[PDB]
Design a protein around this ligand. Structure first.
Ligand code: SAH
Ligand code: SAH
Lengths: 235, 239
């Protein structure tokens, strides 16, 4: 017996709606931004869900990080969630993105919502820009190109960008299930199958690699699209 | 469309095994206790999985709670997970249990494991013993009678048994899916369906009640059999 409840599509969606209804809601402005994003961009399925937004805000309010690093900004949704979750502490948020279209999208949203005082967006290939950062981050959200995750984590660990009591959260580790195998998401539309299959293989390599690193404790949690939590091994 | 990936039974089990393979495992001794529990008891399905064990240990090492409270000990598996996760700080672990059979099992288990004085099993109906507890806990794991969760959380908040920065984790809140609706777990064994439907009705009332409590932030996490995370609202924290 396993640790994951089996649901069909309709029922998964019902249970997700139930979780939303019975969890703290995200702000109206964030809902608005989520819908705006889905209206403007054909690849908006890359953006985190509403429930995931609730999770980001809860996690930031709970952990109270002093500085947050995000890799993969897209339209700025998850950055706005980190911002909401850190209103009390006024945490610095750094987010990395390489697409001009999405840079423009994000700066537009940040101006509209009034979050530029704490959110810093750095434009460029994250594999390069990540290395240029200094100091440390208490919470790091890795959510960019899947085939880059290993490199990102390597940089983060090698340069000490993760604070002693910090956590790394890696998103979409399951690649809709295809990380486990090409046969693990029959419901997925064939049109996006190549992409996600590509991500799956990469994310499998990544996952296996984490288990070979004596510096860290690793937990792959079967929630959302798969979330890997990484921390420094004690002490 | 939402946040949860749909899996059929076989595939869900493969994905669980994948998560285990790709997460740090529980200590050998704890595996031995888990296996022993499954051999000893016919109702061992009440026990958490191995992956959940890794999650408990990770969570404890991460949050570094000073004291941990647990409601529902069963055979001691989750208590020993918390124990493993707090070896460096020697956190006090209080665990509440009412079944004579499981109390005997757990005390023997704790002695075999060689836990110190820091693991404390309190016998009796948790609804009454929980009120007798003093001080505060940084992590509280609710895993007892599903129809009691609301009452437990109420006591916990009313008496300030949760620390300012503490968290409550409530397990099995989905009741296999039946908390959401009686048609949400067609795979479920019919023999345990009435039981879990009862649990689901109680847990649905529980979940709705949390949303009305102005003291707390709530996140119902669609992981395992449903895990409700509860914290004080920033403004509701007290000195
Ligand atoms: N090498 C790279 N460097 C920087 N950004 C990258 C990259 N590869 C991909 N990206 C960006 O990573 C993003 C992934 S989607 C991010 C979603 C966002 N975090 C949310 O939750 O909504 C895309 O915007 C993409 O352009
Ligand atoms: N009212 C009550 N007071 C105290 N314990 C109770 C109770 N109702 C049920 N229980 C106990 O709660 C336990 C739930 S199963 C707990 C499993 C354990 N936490 C693990 O993860 O392995 C059972 O052992 C049951 O006997």
């Amino acid at each position: 017996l396993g640790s994951i409840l089996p649901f069909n599509e309709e029922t998964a969606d019902r249970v997700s709606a139930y979780c939303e209804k019975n969890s703290h809601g995200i702000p109206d402005a964030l809902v608005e931004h989520w819908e705006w994003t889905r209206t403007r961009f054909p690849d908006a399925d890359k953006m985190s869900s509403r429930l995931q937004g609730s999770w980001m805000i809860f996690t930031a309010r709970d952990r109270k990080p002093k500085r947050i690093l995000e890799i993969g900004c897209y339209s700025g949704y998850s950055a706005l969630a980190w911002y909401e979750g850190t209103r009390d502490t006024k945490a610095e948020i750094v987010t990395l993105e390489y697409s001009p279209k999405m840079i423009a999208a994000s700066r537009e949203a940040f101006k509209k919502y009034g979050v530029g005082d704490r959110v810093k967006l750095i434009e460029g290939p994250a594999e390069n820009t990540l290395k240029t950062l200094e100091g440390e981050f208490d919470l790091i959200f890795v959510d960019a190109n899947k085939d880059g995750y290993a490199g990102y984590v390597k940089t983060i660990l090698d340069q000490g960008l993760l604070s002693a009591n910090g956590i790394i959260l890696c998103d979409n580790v399951f690649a809709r299930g295809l990380t486990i195998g090409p046969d693990c998401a029959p419901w997925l539309n064939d049109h996006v199958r190549p992409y996600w299959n590509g991500c799956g293989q990469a994310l499998d390599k990544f996952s296996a690699g984490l288990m070979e690193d004596p510096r860290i404790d690793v937990l792959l949690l079967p929630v959302f699209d798969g979330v890997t939590q990484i921390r420094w091994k004690d002490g």
